[PDB]
Design a protein around this ligand. Structure first.
Ligand SMILES: Cc1c(C(=O)O)ccc2c1N[C@H](c1cc(C(F)(F)F)cc(C(F)(F)F)c1)[C@H]1[C@@H]3CC[C@@H](C3)[C@@H]21
Lengths: 9, 211
């Protein structure tokens, strides 16, 4: 979920 | 929950198996940007935004490429610009699921001329899935879904008044979308197991177990 969290900023 | 904002979200973001997986990884980045443009999504708690996207990403992306393919005969148009014919999919070992997409989604979208507002509303309904496990407040996601399908019904009644069954027709493509989404996931996990198909970082992360 690392990429997904970073993109949801 | 104005349908105009949902249409704006759609317009803003506009071995064959290897090409398909590459396009899917590409579109996962754009999917996040789409969700941020759906009214009230970005105001949900971050953990809930993650839950909804991890629960719906595959159905959301299948609906998108299916609608993109309405003018393609017997094939699909990848987000990379590559047309893939059903003959190519069959020759690569994924003919059955490809034919399901053509017969249950693309052809039916074509036959009723589903428009981009209706597509966006169906995708927003999928996004606001109140059955997603772990949501901090499922009732608020339920409320957002209800706002979407209320706006969709009013839109269909205003724009297509001579088609009183059209709203139900749109909603009754969601079981096929759910089933095709699950079957596509089965294939991707199998490709991952066999190891003969490149899978990029974001697609791979979506295939990870949840936290
Ligand atoms: C083409 C495309 C795009 C695009 O280009 O915009 C974006 C997302 C996806 C797809 N297509 C993928 C798929 C379709 C099929 C079918 F068309 F044959 F049904 C078979 C398989 C498989 F190879 F797995 F069998 C995979 C799906 C996958 C589920 C969510 C992503 C990945 C989703």
């Amino acid at each position: 979920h690392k990429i997904l969290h970073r993109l949801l900023q | 929950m104005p349908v105009e904002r949902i249409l704006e979200a759609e317009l803003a973001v506009e071995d064959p198996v290897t090409n398909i997986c590459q396009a899917a990884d590409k579109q996962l980045f754009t999917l996040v940007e789409w969700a941020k443009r759906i009214p009230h999504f970005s105001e949900l708690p971050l953990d809930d935004q993650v839950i909804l996207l991890r629960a719906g990403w595959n159905e959301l992306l299948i609906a998108s490429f299916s609608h993109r393919s309405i003018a393609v005969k017997d094939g699909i148009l990848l987000a990379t610009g590559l047309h893939v014919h059903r003959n190519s999919a069959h020759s690569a070992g994924v003919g059955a699921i490809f034919d399901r997409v053509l017969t249950e989604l693309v052809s039916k979208m074509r036959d009723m001329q589903m428009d981009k507002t209706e597509l966006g509303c169906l995708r927003a309904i999928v996004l606001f899935n109140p059955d997603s496990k772990g949501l901090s407040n499922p009732a608020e996601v339920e409320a957002l879904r209800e706002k979407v399908y209320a706006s969709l019904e009013a839109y269909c009644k205003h724009k297509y008044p001579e088609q009183p069954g059209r709203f139900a027709k749109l909603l009754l493509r969601l079981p096929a979308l759910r089933s095709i989404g699950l079957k596509c996931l089965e294939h991707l996990f199998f490709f991952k197991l066999i190891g003969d198909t490149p899978i990029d970082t974001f697609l791979m992360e979506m295939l990870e177990a949840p936290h």
